[model samples]
Target: HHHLEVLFQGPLSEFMLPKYAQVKEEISSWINQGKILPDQKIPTENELMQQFGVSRHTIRKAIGDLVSQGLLYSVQGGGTFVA
Candidate 1:
């Protein structure tokens, strides 16, 4: 099931500041929606690049911030997973 397809696709500028924040909001909401749960791996950074149509830096910032907040984490070559 491709439930993750609902993620928005538009100019990052249309959402808000810094771009990463917008991506973060969308992802956090997705997590809250329970479409996926803890111990589950979310999209890969490369997949997310196409999904959000944003740069790697933006994706990293968004996901990295989430990691810091304990909402998610990444393993060495393992991919990102919910916390």
Candidate 2:
């Protein structure tokens, strides 16, 4: 299962999966496909960096892409949220 693969195989780039174009694509898929719903709290930048084996800059780049696309939003003291 995808969840298992993602859990055990480490972070897989969207390039390896056509359903994903970028990390945000993966996030979007999770949201649009019902894996994550609107208003759902997403992981923190640090958490995502560690979990995905990426740098904070990389994670932010991906998150920013989603934010610009209106697929995600962030609250200053809160965190990123699915939208």
Candidate 3:
């Protein structure tokens, strides 16, 4: 089982970077770092919002990007997980 850490826990900039890109980088970083294993389930949107200090919309954009990239997949009513 993977024990994921929060990427960031602090105030977010009013002027934000592209959320999807940021998330992609963060997720890929963890993946490369061996922190997130293949087939590991990623956290939920609420968990992401809390971790990144971003709004749900921003989180969703990030998640959507990952999904499109085949790096993530959503389980209906459950949550998104890594590919």
Candidate 4:
């Protein structure tokens, strides 16, 4: 295994924050929880779509925010990775 199964191991719920914020915060927690490790790849956009059940726009926003915060990085053809 790639040790990325946290993608399906946890549940997502709504909060006072927006959906994108919820995704962002939870994904951040995944990293902190060590479910996703440094240099390890995370679920892809397509994969997240099914998991989060959110729109592509929302996924992009959530991922983009993580990238901006230096928590994750995206490659053109490769998957996103922990920092």
Q: lDDT: which candidate is best?
A: 1
**Candidate 2's TM-score:** 0.71
Model 2 score (lDDT): 0.70
lDDT of 3 by residue, 35-81 (tens): 76677877788888877777889788888887898877888898777
Instruction: Put down candidate 2 lDDT per residue, 29-49, tens digits, no spaces.
Output: 778899878898988877777
The C-alpha lDDT values of all candidates are 0.83, 0.70, 0.73, 0.82
TM-score, per-candidate, Cα-based: 0.80, 0.71, 0.70, 0.80
Residue pairs clashing, model 1: none
Full ranking by lDDT: 1, 4, 3, 2
Instruction: Kindly report which residue stretches of model 3 are placed more than 4 angstroms away from their true locations once superposed.
Output: 1-16
Query: Could you report the Cα RMSD, in angstroms, for every candidate shown?
Result: 3.3, 5.2, 4.7, 5.4
Colliding residue pairs in candidate 4? none
Q: What lDDT tens digits, residue by residue, belong to model 4 across residues 49-72?
A: 777877889889999999999999
Clashes of 1: 0
Against the true structure, candidate 3 reaches a TM-score of: 0.70
